[PDB]
Design a protein around this nucleic acid. Structure first.
Ligand SMILES: [Mg+2]
Ligand SMILES: [Mg+2]
Lengths: 124, 124
RNA sequence: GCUGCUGCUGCUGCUGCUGC
RNA sequence: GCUGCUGCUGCUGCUGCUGC
């Protein structure tokens, strides 16, 4: 039923071989990147994104979704009753989740973006 | 079995009558405060704190836990295997949760504090 | 990195009761 | 505001399998 995703960048999950190779070359503080997801009701969209802790890379992955792209994907699932909406992100052993009802989506996005930036800039 | 809390401020949950009164006087954007919790393994500590969106109030409630008060409370429950640790806060219809294993507690506290400040400064 | 599952706190949305 | 429950995605920790 091909769904519009909130994401503006394609998934970059490593293959199992690429993951083994990265592991032989390096440590949980320097993974290949991070995982993030958006959930609206019972539908979830997920991304693995490469991230290397540079300014350029930060800027690139911050661009993976916007308030507008989230609203566009989310509103496919809206009606009279509120549904639940959840952003989640995992990096270096820490998961941050931001959730609330669909009436609060704009506030959710604003808190999701700040969490994502702060987590990705976590000092080692 | 009276447990040491990660919290430095006592609970301020309103009574049902105080809540009804506040409701007659005012709207979900101006609650009496916020709720936060700290979970270590299966034990949870909770607080309802009064908050009025002023600088003085923000300063007061940011003092309800620190990295040290959290580590003191948490370490009671530690051993060789990791346990799961979770901070959560809810204000104005948004929940943030920050979790991970006991090996990442410091990082959890750093992210928890930032989420708490950002959420409590959420522009209406 | 992924799919699948077992035990174990918690979270969103909805639903109803307590005083309640 | 609280206690208790019903249905419904997700999250931490632990456990094992996939290629896997
Ligand atoms: Mg995730
Ligand atoms: Mg809570």
């Amino acid at each position: 039923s091909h769904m519009t995703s909130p994401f503006k960048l394609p998934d970059e999950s490593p293959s199992w071989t690429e993951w083994r190779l990265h592991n032989d070359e390096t440590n949980q503080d320097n993974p290949l990147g991070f995982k993030e997801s958006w959930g609206f009701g019972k539908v979830v969209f997920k991304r693995y994104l490469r991230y290397d802790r540079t300014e350029a890379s930060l800027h690139r992955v911050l661009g993976s979704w916007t308030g507008d792209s989230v609203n566009y994907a989310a509103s496919r699932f809206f009606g009279f009753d509120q549904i639940g909406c959840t952003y989640s992100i995992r990096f270096r052993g820490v998961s941050i989740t931001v959730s609330g009802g669909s009436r609060t989506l704009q506030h959710l996005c604003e808190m999701a973006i700040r969490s994502k930036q702060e987590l990705l800039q976590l000092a080692p």
